[PDB]
């Protein structure tokens, strides 16, 4: 009667962890820019994202357990480090300063310090007194006229970016090593947890941008029919709230100040591109969102609040309470300059039962030590010209405050700073499995002798 | 077609009439003058090494066995009914992987031991003695 039979290639899979790999388009390497910011030695993208839908698969998911959020997090900041290593260091720069308040206009009136200073040059034997104009966020004073050095000059060293690289988040597909697979939850409404019938397998992911933004989402993926309410523990108040956009939101973030650059010789081979003249007038960075689309956004969001948290309550908005400048602002690059926008007016509403763009002040800062990996601060060399960057807003990052009442009102405030909510918000519904091909089935078949 | 893992929501009969397309999946993946300091290809080629070494542990199995390919293979290894007690209708009609995989983990241990024992005992030795004529 019975014997056994051995089968190969059976659909048996479990979960595992590994390192994925990139797939950049070869079009961006035509703009290689001597290592265009992210892509240095990536894989060309397969033009066929082979997606096979898998019937009768209902796998429990969580966007809070297993990903390369941490791994690709350290990969992106390791790319940040590999960018910072060979490029221009700014070691002899901790020199005391002779600065004065600028006098051109009133829109900044302050904040622009005409800082003269001694320095050396190429000929080690030589000196060089110079003056430059700096934004107030890159310096700090020290305690006749006031003196000001640099805030890192007692904590961490400083490098500036070598100006050849770009700063663009690149659409990069993320592909799996073979013998593994990537799955996809193709439903409409999915808060990140639970099962999923709509299962497809893809060899790779879609093209994914390394976006650096606080409190929101820029150029990310867009949600389905409703804006979703994604978190891990809404009963917890320490958890943030991810709201992916059904409809994207237009924004016009501008650096409206035409500028000039002064390249001063600290060499040999070293040099520093300082701030030249602001050609024209003095303005601040600002961004524009139309008020009606913002109102419909707040209304659709608060409908999802009365779908998810309670049904009948008061939803009143306050701004960020305080803290760090990157925490209090939607903080993000505009090409090469980092806008820190006062998002106080966008959190002034109240919801109980039932043609103009909104302009907010934005601030720019150059000496940055982002992700708080203290030991190496980054400096941004200046850029000429009025910079106008058209980004489109693609989601929300918010906090739930302490309740402390009997569901009277709810004050919701901005949050972020981790960027891992950008990782999870751009990397949910995907997972990593290992594959087992071996099968053994007993039956009455027998080999010969 | 079924493509890749198209026999997922199936039974091992209809799956078993497939899966060489699924079997031919170990390698499907396959700019040196800019500054020549890279980090990605170290871990990428490392993953190629790990995948190939995984497949060669698999070919270490598919080598040393009575199942040198033989993409699927029958045996001469018996079956105790104390191990499982189902019908070919109950499995081949509707039972495909899950607790089937848990049972063939028990007899991954026991029955892979029986692959070693059945291989050593007289699949080669009696083959030599009957071969020696």
């Amino acid at each position, epitope marked *: 009667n019975l014997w056994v039979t051995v089968y190969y290639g059976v659909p048996v899979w*479990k979960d595992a962890e590994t390192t994925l790999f990139c797939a950049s388009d070869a079009k961006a390497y035509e703009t290689e820019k001597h290592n265009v910011w992210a892509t240095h030695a990536c894989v060309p993208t397969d033009p066929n994202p082979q997606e096979i839908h898998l019937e009768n698969v*209902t796998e*429990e998911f*969580n966007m809070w357990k297993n990903n390369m959020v941490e791994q690709m997090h350290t990969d992106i900041i390791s790319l940040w480090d590999q960018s910072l290593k060979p490029c221009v260091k700014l070691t002899p720069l901790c020199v005391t300063l002779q600065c004065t308040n600028v006098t051109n206009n009133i829109t900044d009136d302050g904040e622009l310090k005409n800082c003269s200073f001694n320095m050396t040059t190429e000929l080690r034997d030589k000196k060089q007194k110079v003056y430059s104009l700096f934004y107030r966020l890159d310096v700090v004073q020290i305690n006749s006229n006031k003196e000001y050095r640099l805030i890192n000059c007692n904590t961490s060293a400083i490098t500036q970016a070598c100006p050849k690289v770009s700063f663009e988040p690149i659409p990069i597909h993320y592909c799996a090593p073979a013998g593994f697979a990537i799955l996809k939850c193709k439903d409409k409404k999915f808060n990140g*947890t*639970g*099962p999923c019938p709509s299962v497809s397998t893809v060899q790779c992911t879609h093209g994914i941008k390394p976006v650096v933004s606080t409190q929101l989402l820029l150029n990310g993926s867009l949600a389905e029919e409703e804006v979703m309410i994604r978190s891990e*523990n*809404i*009963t917890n108040n320490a958890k943030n709230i991810l709201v992916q956009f059904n409809t994207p939101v237009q924004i016009n973030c501008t650096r409206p100040n035409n500028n000039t650059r002064k390249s001063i010789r600290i060499g040999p081979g070293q040099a520093f591109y300082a701030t030249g003249d602001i050609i024209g007038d003095i303005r601040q960075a600002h961004c524009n969102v139309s008020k009606a689309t913002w109102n419909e956004t707040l209304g659709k969001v608060v409908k999802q609040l009365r779908k998810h*948290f*309670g049904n009948n309550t008061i939803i009143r908005f306050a701004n960020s309470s305080g803290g760090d400048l990157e925490v209090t602002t939607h903080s993000f690059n505009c090409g090469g300059e980092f806008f820190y926008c006062n998002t106080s007016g966008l959190f002034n509403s109240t919801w109980i039962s039932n043609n103009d763009s909104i302009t907010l002040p934005c601030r720019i800062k150059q000496i940055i030590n982002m992700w708080q990996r203290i030991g190496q601060a980054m400096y941004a060399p200046p850029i000429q010209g009025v910079i106008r960057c058209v980004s489109n807003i693609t989601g929300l990052i918010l906090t*739930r405050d302490g*309740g402390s009442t009997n*569901s009277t009102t709810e004050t919701f405030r901005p949050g972020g700073g981790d960027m891992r909510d950008n990782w999870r918000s751009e990397l949910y519904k995907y997972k990593v499995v290992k594959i087992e091909p071996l099968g053994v089935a007993p039956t009455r078949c027998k080999r010969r002798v | 077609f079924l493509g890749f893992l198209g026999a997922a929501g199936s039974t091992m009969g209809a799956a078993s009439m497939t899966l060489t397309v699924q079997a031919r999946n170990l390698l499907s993946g396959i700019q040196q003058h800019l500054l020549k300091l890279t980090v990605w290809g170290i871990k990428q080629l490392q993953a190629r090494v790990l995948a190939v070494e995984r497949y060669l542990r698999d070919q270490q199995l598919l080598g040393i066995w009575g199942c040198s390919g033989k993409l699927i293979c029958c045996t001469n290894v018996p079956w105790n009914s*104390s*191990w*499982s*007690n189902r019908n070919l209708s109950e499995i081949w009609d509707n039972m495909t992987w*899950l*607790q089937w995989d*848990k*049972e063939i983990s028990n007899y991954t241990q026991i029955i892979y031991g029986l692959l070693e024992e059945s291989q050593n005992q007289q699949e080669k030795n009696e083959q030599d003695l009957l071969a020696l004529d």
Partner: antibody, heavy 132, light 109 residues
Framework: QIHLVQSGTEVKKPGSSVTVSCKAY?????????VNWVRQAPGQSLEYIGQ??????????HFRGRVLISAVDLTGSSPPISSLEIKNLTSDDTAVYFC??????????????????????WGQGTLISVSA | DIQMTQSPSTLSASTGDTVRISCRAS???????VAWYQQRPGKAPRLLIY???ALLGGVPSRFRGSAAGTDFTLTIGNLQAEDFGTFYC?????????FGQGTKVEVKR
């Protein structure tokens, strides 16, 4: 940590209905944990009444159609909660009623066998006394 | 339904003893879908062993179970004061899950 707190002891007369509550603290969601309701008659063995897994309500044939087991997911106000409602009480229903939470995220756990499972978390107990 | 017949109904032992409680099923449970529970009077049962040889996180090493065919055995070596009480075997191979009559573990005197 996860425990499980049930409603207070209730006295009921024959033919009445009753709903017992069960707050699951520490439980992250009922998408990754299943709820089983088991009663223990006085000085007796335990008996399975029903469960709710993958948001699917079910009851044992002996109690089939006589009982309704609902549960609601986590809220910002309150942890996720399950409810065991029993209609038309008889004196043979006088027993203690227990809440059960077992993780369901992993397929290989061996705690669960296609919805039929063992019971990893338990509650204090609700005494349901049925007498005229 | 599976019928779990537990044995013995009552046993007496002392601290440090090694004690064995048996539980037979009406059918044979290959998958070893059987759990063991400890219940001291008044308080809720504790899950000690699932799937025969598997100890639940936090259960002492001296609890170990064995499963062969229809018969099942819970073994408590080095009996401790905290271990005394009532024990139940539970199968979950076929719906619905069924428990045993139980086994009482009293102190020797």
């Amino acid at each position: 940590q996860i425990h499980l707190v049930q409603s207070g002891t209730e006295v009921k007369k024959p033919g009445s209905s009753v709903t017992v509550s069960c707050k699951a603290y520490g439980v992250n969601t009922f998408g990754l944990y299943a709820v089983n309701w088991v009663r223990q008659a006085p000085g007796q063995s335990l008996e399975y009444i029903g469960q709710i897994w993958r948001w699917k309500s079910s009851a044992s044939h002996h109690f089939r159609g006589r009982v309704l087991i609902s549960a609601v997911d986590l809220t910002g106000s309150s942890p996720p909660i399950s409810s065991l409602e029993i209609k038309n009480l008889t004196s043979d229903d006088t027993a203690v009623y227990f809440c059960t939470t077992t993780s369901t995220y992993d397929r290989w756990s061996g705690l669960h066998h296609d919805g039929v499972m063992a019971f990893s978390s338990w509650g204090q107990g609700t005494l349901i006394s049925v007498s005229a | 339904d599976i019928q779990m017949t537990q044995s013995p109904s009552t046993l007496s032992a002392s601290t440090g003893d090694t004690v064995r409680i048996s539980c037979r099923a009406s059918q044979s449970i290959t998958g070893n879908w059987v759990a063991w529970y400890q219940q001291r009077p008044g308080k809720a049962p504790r899950l000690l062993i699932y799937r025969g040889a598997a100890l639940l996180g936090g259960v002492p090493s001296r609890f170990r179970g064995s499963a062969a065919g229809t018969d099942f055995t819970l073994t408590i070596g080095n009996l401790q004061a905290e271990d005394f009480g009532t024990f139940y075997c539970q199968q979950y191979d076929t719906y619905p899950g069924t428990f045993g009559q139980g086994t009482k573990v009293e102190v020797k005197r």
